[PDB]
Amino acid sequence: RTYLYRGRILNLALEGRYEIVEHKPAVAVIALREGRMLFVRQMRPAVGLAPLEIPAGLIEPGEDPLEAARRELAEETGLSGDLTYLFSYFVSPGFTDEKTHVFLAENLKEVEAIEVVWMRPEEALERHQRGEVEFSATGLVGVLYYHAFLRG
Amino acid sequence: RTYLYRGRILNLALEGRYEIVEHKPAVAVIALREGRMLFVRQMRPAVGLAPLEIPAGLIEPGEDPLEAARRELAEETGLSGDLTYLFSYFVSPGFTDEKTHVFLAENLKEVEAIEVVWMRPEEALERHQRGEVEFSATGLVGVLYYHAFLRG
Numbered sequence: 076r077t078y079l080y081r082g083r084i085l086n087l088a089l090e091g092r093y094e095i096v097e098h099k100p101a102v103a104v105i106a107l108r109e110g111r112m113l114f115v116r117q118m119r120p121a122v123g124l125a126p127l128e129i130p131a132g133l134i135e136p137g138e139d140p141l142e143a144a145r146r147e148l149a150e151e152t153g154l155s156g157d158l159t160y161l162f163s164y165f166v167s168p169g170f171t172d173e174k175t176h177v178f179l180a181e182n183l184k185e186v187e188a189i190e191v192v193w194m195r196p197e198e199a200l201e202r203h204q205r206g207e208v209e210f211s212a213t214g215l216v217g218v219l220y221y222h223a224f225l226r227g
Numbered sequence: 228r229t230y231l232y233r234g235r236i237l238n239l240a241l242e243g244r245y246e247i248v249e250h251k252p253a254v255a256v257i258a259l260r261e262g263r264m265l266f267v268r269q270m271r272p273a274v275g276l277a278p279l280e281i282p283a284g285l286i287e288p289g290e291d292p293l294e295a296a297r298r299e300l301a302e303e304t305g306l307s308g309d310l311t312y313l314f315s316y317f318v319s320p321g322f323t324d325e326k327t328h329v330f331l332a333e334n335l336k337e338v339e340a341i342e343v344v345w346m347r348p349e350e351a352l353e354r355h356q357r358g359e360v361e362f363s364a365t366g367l368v369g370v371l372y373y374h375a376f377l378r379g
C-alpha cells in the first residue's frame with residue numbers, strides 16, 4: 076500500500092489498482108424520548124446540504140467506542156444517559172475503512188454549529204419519502220432500528 | 228474547491244479546510260425469499276475482510292438508480308424481480324458525497340468474485356452480535372429494514 080495523501084481525517088492510499096481512503100473509526104448514538112428520536116443537523120460541505128443524522132463523531136486518540144459515544148452525546152446535545160452497544164458497520168467498504176459503532180442511549184439527563192432536531196422517527200421517514208429531507212447512514216439506521224425494536 | 232487527485236471511483240478535493248472525496252452515487256437491493264435475505268460477500272481490500280452486504284454497486288453513466296439496481300441484482304446474483312424504491316442515504320456526509328439509493332426486490336426470477344449468501348436476517352444479526360461477521364451499511368440497512376417492515 077502506497078500513500079498519495081495524509082490529511083486531518085483521512086489518508087488517500089493506493090493498493091495496486093484499489094484506491095483506499097483510510098479514515099478514523101466513528102460512533103453514533105440512537106436516543107429515543109417520549110416517541111421522539113434525537114436527530115442533529117449541521118452544514119456538510121461534502122454534500123452541499125444538511126442531512127438528518129443522529130449524534131455522531133470520530134473516536135479520538137485514547138478512547139474506545141463507548142467513551143466516544145458518551146462524549147459526542149454530551150458535546151453535540153448537552154445530554155448523557157445509559158449507553159448500550161448495538162452493532163457496527165463499514166460505511167462504504169468498497170473504498171473506505173471507516174467503521175461506525177452504534178449505541179443506544181436511555182434515561183437521558185441534561186448535563187450542559189450543530190442543530191438539535193427532536194423528531195418522531197415516523198415523521199423523519201415520511202419527510203424523507205417526500206423529498207423534504209436527506210438521510211445520512213446514521214440517521215437512516217436510527218429510523219430503521221426504531222421501527223424494528225423500539226415501538227414497544 | 229481544488230483537486231489533489233482524480234481517480235477511477237473517486238476524486239480527492241480540498242474546499243478550504245474541508246477534505247472532500249467525490250464519489251459516484253450507488254444503489255443497494257434488499258431481497259427477501261422464504262424468510263431468507265439475499266446477502267453477498269466479496270474481498271474488500273479497503274477493509275482487509277469480507278463484510279456481509281446486499282447486492283449493490285455504482286451507477287454507471289447514462290443509467291438512473293432503478294436501472295442500476297436491476298443491473299447489480301442481475302450481475303451479482305443472476306436474478307431479476309419487481310423493484311420498488313425505498314429510500315436513500317449519504318454513507319458518510321462528513322467527508323464524502325457518496326449517496327446510496329436502496330430498493331426492494333420481489334418475485335425473484337433467475338435469468339442467468341462475489342459470494343451469494345442467502346441468510347435469515349435474524350441469523351445475520353445474531354452472527355454479527357457474536358463478532359462472527361461484519362456489516363457494511365447496506366447489509367445492516369437490509370437487516371434493520373426487514374425486522375421493521377418485512378416480518379409480516
Ligand SMILES: Nc1ncnc2c1ncn2[C@@H]1O[C@H](COP(=O)(O)O)[C@@H](O)[C@H]1O
Binds near residue numbers: 092169273283284
Ligand atoms: N477501491 C477501488 N479503487 C479503484 N477501483 C475500484 C475500487 N473498488 C472497486 N473498483 C473497481 O470498480 C468497479 C466498481 O464495482 P463495485 O466494487 O462493486 O462498486 C469494480 O468492478 C472494480 O473493478
Ligand SMILES: Nc1ncnc2c1ncn2[C@@H]1O[C@H](COP(=O)(O)O)[C@@H](O)[C@H]1O
Binds near residue numbers: 084132246321322
Ligand atoms: N471533511 C473534513 N476535512 C477536514 N477536517 C474536517 C472535515 N470534516 C470535519 N472536520 C473537522 O474535524 C472534526 C471532526 O468532527 P465531525 O465532523 O463531527 O466528525 C470537526 O471538529 C471539524 O472541525
Ligand SMILES: [Mg+2]
Binds near residue numbers: 131132133
Ligand atoms: Mg468528529
Ligand SMILES: [Mg+2]
Binds near residue numbers: 283284285
Ligand atoms: Mg460497482
